[PDB]
Amino acid sequence: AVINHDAVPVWPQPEPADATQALAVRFKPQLDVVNGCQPYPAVDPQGNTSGGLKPSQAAACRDMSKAQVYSRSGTYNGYYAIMYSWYMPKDSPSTGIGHRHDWENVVVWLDNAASANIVALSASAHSGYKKSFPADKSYLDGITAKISYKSTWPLDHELGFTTSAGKQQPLIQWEQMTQAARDALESTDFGNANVPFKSNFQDKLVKAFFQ
Ligand SMILES: [Mg+2]
Ligand SMILES: [Mg+2]
CA gap 5, 19 in Å, rounded: 33
Compute the distance between CA of residue 92 and CA of residue 201 in angstroms, rounded to an integer.
26
Around ion ligand 1, residues with a beta carbon closer than 5 Å are 6, 63
Give 77's DSSP letter: T
Q: Residue 8 has what DSSP assignment?
A: S
Amino acid at site 115: S
Give the number of residues written for the chain: 211
Q: Residue 4 to residues 53, 59, 195: CA-CA distances in angstroms?
A: 9, 16, 18
> Distance between CA atoms of 121 and 140, rounded to whole angstroms?
10
- Name the closest ligand to CA 192: 2
* Residues followed by a gap in the chain, C→N > 2.5 Å: 56
Experimental approach was X-ray
Annotated binding site for Mg(2+): 6, 91, 102, 104, 157
What is the rounded distance in angstroms from the CA atom of residue 175 to the CA atom of residue 186? 14
> Which residues lie at CB < 5 A from ion ligand 2?
91, 102, 156-157
DSSP H or E segment with residue 180: helix 179-187
What's the reported resolution, in angstroms, to a tenth? 1.4
Beta strands at 79-91 and 140-141: parallel, antiparallel or unpaired:
unpaired
User: H-helix or E-strand containing 205?
Assistant: helix 201-208
Return the amino acid letter for 210: F
